[PDB]
Amino acid sequence: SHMHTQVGRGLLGAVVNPLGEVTDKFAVTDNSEILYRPVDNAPPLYSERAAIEKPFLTGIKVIDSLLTCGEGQRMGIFASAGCGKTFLMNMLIEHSGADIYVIGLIGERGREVTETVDYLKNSEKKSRCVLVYATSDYSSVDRCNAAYIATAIAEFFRTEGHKVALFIDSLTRYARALRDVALAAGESPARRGYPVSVFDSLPRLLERPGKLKAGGSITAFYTVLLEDDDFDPLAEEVRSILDGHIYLSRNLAQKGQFPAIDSLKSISRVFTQVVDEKHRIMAAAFRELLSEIEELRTISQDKIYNKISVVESFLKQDYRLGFTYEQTMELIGETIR
Ligand SMILES: Nc1ncnc2c1ncn2[C@@H]1O[C@H](COP(=O)(O)OP(=O)(O)NP(=O)(O)O)[C@@H](O)[C@H]1O
Ligand SMILES: [Mg+2]
Ligand SMILES: [Mg+2]
Ligand SMILES: [Mg+2]
Ligand SMILES: [Mg+2]
Ligand SMILES: [Mg+2]
Ligand SMILES: [Mg+2]
Ligand SMILES: [Mg+2]
Ligand SMILES: [Mg+2]
Ligand SMILES: [Mg+2]
Ligand SMILES: [Mg+2]
Ligand SMILES: [Mg+2]
Ligand SMILES: [Mg+2]
Ligand SMILES: [Mg+2]
Ligand SMILES: [Mg+2]
Ligand SMILES: [Mg+2]
Ligand SMILES: [Mg+2]
């Protein structure tokens, strides 16, 4: 692919379609830097990467505490329908502290793209975001390119030295679109209706993020849309390529526990290397308390029972609230004492 796309501070505040034109704005920005960069870009050389050591603070208590992210990390978000994945995304943008946010919405309905644009228009981060989208009326090629364009905009901000958060919602529809392109090129379905080339191409896309020795980072969140145990190689491919997954539980969602993150089914694979030992001990104590609260949910013992409302109160977090690290750990501290 020879296609270049616009990059620069000029795009901050902009809503961009798969063809590169601006079709709405959620903020206007003084700078009008516009340059061009390729949408196909190799990931960094291993020699160019910095170790993930500094946390990417989300402002989300259950994550910052039990599933701490690292700057330069790739994190999966796995969710079935209506478990609040879009709100989680909005939260991760709002309550974090990145310099730049780049969002890529792939094959969503026009109503879904407008929720996000509506969200940005009302957010403090508006001056810091770029939104790229391909609504469901767009072709497979356009859905794919929307993901590349988004990544390429993040890449440019990273080379500038910035601390960038990339969001791709969803890889599921990205892979479906990539599949159709492959089928139309005459490729054969391998195992599930996907030709083998779409899974083979995934590492190249999903390894473009990361921390650079030279300065700057992309921390990336990729959503994977789950069916209710219906017929999911894509999820297991993504689980294996990223370094962590946040699982959204429908049980917790219907129950009202938002964000419906199931810590037992989630992991950050950089956890240990981005939090100190006091955090680790405190977090592991908290997980012990959790698994002890689940032993009760099978229907001293009464003491952990009284710890439930304070725990649930720790987990639950209205999408409009953000918590500092100190606030979150302060709260963890109280539930384990
Ligand atoms: N943290 C939260 N605080 C408050 N309300 C929440 C929260 N999370 C979810 N909700 C509620 O749940 C809905 C959020 O749905 P949404 O975030 O779009 O999930 P979704 O998985 O993206 N839906 P879909 O994309 O079509 O599968 C809203 O109608 C809210 O009322
Ligand atoms: Mg850029
Ligand atoms: Mg453009
Ligand atoms: Mg280094
Ligand atoms: Mg955990
Ligand atoms: Mg939604
Ligand atoms: Mg969103
Ligand atoms: Mg819809
Ligand atoms: Mg169209
Ligand atoms: Mg098509
Ligand atoms: Mg095969
Ligand atoms: Mg890295
Ligand atoms: Mg890893
Ligand atoms: Mg939430
Ligand atoms: Mg609340
Ligand atoms: Mg608060
Ligand atoms: Mg903080």
The three-class DSSP label of residue 228 is coil
Concatenate the DSSP letters of all residues of 283-305 into one string. Answer: HHHHHHHHHHHHHHT---HHHHH
- 101 ligand 1 Cβ < 6 A: no
Structure tokens at 158: 């990273």
CA distance 289 to 142: 47
CA distance 200 to 203: 7
Helix (H) or strand (E) holding 24: strand 22-25
CA distance 178 to 194: 9
Annotated ligand binding at 271? The verdict is no
- 120 ligand 1 Cβ < 6 A: no
- Of 94, 274, 261, nearest to 167 by C-alpha is 94
What number does the ligand 1 atom closest to the CA of 108 have? Answer: 25
Annotated ligand binding at 87? The verdict is yes
Residue 279 is given by DSSP the state H
- 223 ligand 1 Cβ < 6 A: no
Q: Which amino acid is located at 86 in the chain?
A: T
Which residues neighbour 165 within 8 Å (Cβ) at sequence distance 6 or greater?
A: 56, 92, 93, 96, 98, 100, 101, 102, 218, 219, 220, 221
CA geometry: angle 88, 298, 268, nearest 5 deg: 35
Annotated ligand binding at 83? The verdict is yes
* Under 8 Å between Cβ of 243 and 274: no
Phi and psi at residue 168, to the nearest 5° = -125, 115
Which residues neighbour 336 within 8 Å (Cβ) at sequence distance 6 or greater?
A: 282, 285, 286, 289
CA distance 229 to 251: 14
Q: CA–CA distance from 221 to each of 35, 104, 231 (Å)?
A: 25, 10, 24
167-198 burial code (b ≥16 CB/10 A, e <16): bbbbbbbbbbbbbbbbbeeeeeeeeeebbebb
Q: Which of 87, 113, 170 gets mutated to test ligand 1 (max ligand atoms within 8 A of its CB)? A: 87
The three-class DSSP label of residue 311 is helix
CA distance 260 to 158: 31
- Of 58, 57, 72, 38, nearest to 151 by C-alpha is 38
CA distance 69 to 67: 6
Tokens 């009464």 label which residue?
302
3-state secondary structure 90-149: HHHHHCCCCCEEEEEEEEECHHHHHHHHHHHHCCHHHHHEEEEEEECCCCHHHHHHHHHH
In this structure, the strands spanning 244-247 and 74-79 are parallel
Annotated ligand binding at 85? The verdict is yes
Is the preceding peptide bond at 55 cis, omega within 30 degrees of 0? no
Q: Enumerate residues with CB within 5 Å of ligand 5 (an ion).
A: 66, 263
Q: Is the dihedral of CA 156, 2, 138, 136 positive or negative?
A: negative
Residue 42 CB coordination number (10 Å): 9
The three-class DSSP label of residue 282 is helix
List, in sequence order, every residue forming a beta bridge with 103; answer none if it has no partner: 131, 167
Given resolution (angstroms) = 2.3
Cα 193 to middle of ligand 10, angstroms: 16
CA distance 132 to 137: 15
Q: Whose CA is nearest to atom 12 of ligand 1?
A: 84
* Under 8 Å between Cβ of 103 and 164: no
Which residues neighbour 54 within 8 Å (Cβ) at sequence distance 6 or greater?
A: 70, 71, 274
Task: Identify the experimental approach.
Answer: X-ray
CA distance 287 to 281: 10
Residue spans of beta strands (DSSP E) within 28-93: 35-38, 55-56, 69-70, 74-79
Cα 82 to middle of ligand 1, angstroms: 6
Concatenate the DSSP letters of all residues of 185-210 into one string. Answer: TTPPP-SSSS-HHHHHHHHHHHTS-E
The three-class DSSP label of residue 181 is helix
Q: Which of 112, 227, 258, 261 gets mutated to test ligand 1 (max ligand atoms within 8 A of its CB)? A: 258
What number does the ligand 1 atom closest to the CA of 258 have? Answer: 1
Alpha carbon 71 to its chain centroid, in Å, reads 12
Cα 334 to middle of ligand 11, angstroms: 53
* Ligand nearest the Cα atom of residue 31: 2
Cα 34 to middle of ligand 15, angstroms: 41
List, in sequence order, every residue forming a beta bridge with 257; answer none if it has no partner: none
Backbone breaks in the chain after residues (C–N over 2.5 Å): 231, 299
Structure tokens at 269: 């694979």
Cα 53 to middle of ligand 16, angstroms: 26
- Of 83, 53, 103, nearest to 266 by C-alpha is 83
- 107 ligand 1 Cβ < 6 A: no
- 83 ligand 1 Cβ < 6 A: yes
* Under 8 Å between Cβ of 247 and 266: yes
* Under 8 Å between Cβ of 72 and 52: yes
- Of 261, 191, 202, 266, nearest to 231 by C-alpha is 191
Is the preceding peptide bond at 127 cis, omega within 30 degrees of 0? no
